[PDB]
């Protein structure tokens, strides 16, 4: 389930474990999820309100969101997260073509006229 | 060139041999059919010659005969370089159709029959690998001229 996003699945079986205590593995689980998600609000979202990304993860009002809002952007406003989905600046590379190319090329006319 | 000069005939009628070799530098060319039916060796004699030169001249007249001079540095009519790479594809289909004409009969008659058999119409093969060629170089020079140029300006 953590292969594909089963998160809250796998939240439940936090918890619903049978064998027994686990609590190690399942908080190094309940942290490595935890960067996840602080990773998942950084997608190309609208303005989230403070519900419904504040209630994504297992918290009512702690300053946790204030410490992942902190910690990251979408950043804490009128009710407010915001998107900074820029994703401008890096196309339009001609030069780096213009260098790979060139070595490219000369590879090509090396094992064409160049007896091997 | 072969330069020449007269050997007297009044030895011709002694009877005797001139010229006395010493060194193993006369003969080392054949003389021609042409000047042996000539006076070739009854009236006059061969000098073997050679060249002087030097680096002062061969480089300057290496270095000068033929040179492009930026002309590499340049787009080759950049419309018809695509229609020039279309105006060998297209008979290049047909002659590749040729050359599925060419291979079946083998299996066949011994190929010096294919050798004598052949002069009187075009091979696929040799046709074909020309222009392969030709297409090749005809477009890697243009591509990579193409492409320094957008590093060097700007």
Request: net charge neutral.
């Amino acid at each position: 389930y953590l292969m594909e996003g089963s998160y809250n699945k796998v939240f439940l079986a936090k918890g619903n474990i049978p064998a027994e205590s686990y609590t190690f593995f399942i908080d190094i689980l309940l942290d490595t999820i935890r960067d996840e998600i602080a990773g998942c609000i950084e997608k190309a979202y609208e303005k989230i309100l403070f519900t419904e990304a504040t209630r994504i993860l297992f918290f009512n009002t702690p300053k946790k969101m204030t410490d992942y809002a902190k910690k990251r952007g979408w950043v804490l406003g009128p009710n407010n997260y915001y998107s900074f989905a820029s994703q401008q600046q890096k196309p339009e590379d001609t030069t780096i073509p213009s260098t790979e190319l060139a070595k490219q090329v000369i590879e090509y006319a090396r094992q064409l006229e160049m007896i091997v | 060139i072969d330069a020449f000069r007269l050997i007297n005939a009044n030895m011709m009628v002694l009877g005797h041999e001139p010229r006395q070799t010493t060194s193993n530098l006369g003969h080392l060319n054949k003389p021609s059919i042409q000047a042996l039916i000539h006076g070739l060796n009854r009236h006059y004699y061969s000098i073997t010659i050679n060249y002087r030169k030097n680096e002062l001249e061969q480089k300057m007249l290496l270095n000068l005969h033929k040179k492009s001079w930026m002309e590499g540095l340049t787009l080759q009519d950049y419309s018809e370089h695509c229609k020039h790479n279309e105006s060998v594809v297209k008979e290049m289909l047909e002659l590749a159709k040729n050359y599925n004409k060419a291979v079946e009969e083998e299996d066949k008659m011994t190929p010096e029959q294919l050798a004598i058999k052949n002069v009187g119409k075009q091979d696929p093969k040799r046709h074909l690998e020309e222009h392969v060629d030709v297409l090749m170089t005809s477009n890697i020079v243009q591509c990579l001229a193409a492409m320094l140029d957008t590093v060097v300006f700007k």
